[PDB]
Amino acid sequence: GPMGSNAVKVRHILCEKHGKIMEAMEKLKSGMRFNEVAAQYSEDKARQGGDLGWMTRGSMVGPFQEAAFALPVSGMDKPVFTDPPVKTKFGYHIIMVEGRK
Ligand SMILES: [Cl-]
Numbered sequence: 001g002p003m004g005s006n007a008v009k010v011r012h013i014l015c016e017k018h019g020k021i022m023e024a025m026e027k028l029k030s031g032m033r034f035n036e037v038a039a040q041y042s043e044d045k046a047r048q049g050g051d052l053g054w055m056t057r058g059s060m061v062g063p064f065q066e067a068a069f070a071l072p073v074s075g076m077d078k079p080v081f082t083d084p085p086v087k088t089k090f091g092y093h094i095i096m097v098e099g100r101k
């Protein structure tokens with residue numbers, strides 16, 4: 001149905017350990033750009049600055065998906081990200097959204 005066409009262009013920082021995702025969160029809250037935090041801490045897409053690219057509805061693990069579609073589009077100077085981090089079976093994610101349809 002139509003909702004299957006919904007999509008977000010998503011960027012994340014993924015860490016399996018809570019202590020480490022909290023270190024990443026502290027860096028965001030100090031003003032560090034999201035891609036630079038992802039390079040430092042993310043265990044996925046680190047070499048892409050956390051960028052997952054576009055992901056359609058149904059393609060994301062459940063808690064991630066719900067969190068991502070709840071975020072408005074933002075840019076990395078004016079980010080809007082998940083706080084607190086979102087737990088999935090991959091670990092803890094901090095997510096921002098750069099595009100929406
Ligand atoms: Cl600016």
Ligand SMILES: [Cl-]
Pocket residue numbers: 061062063087088089090
């Ligand atoms: Cl999950």
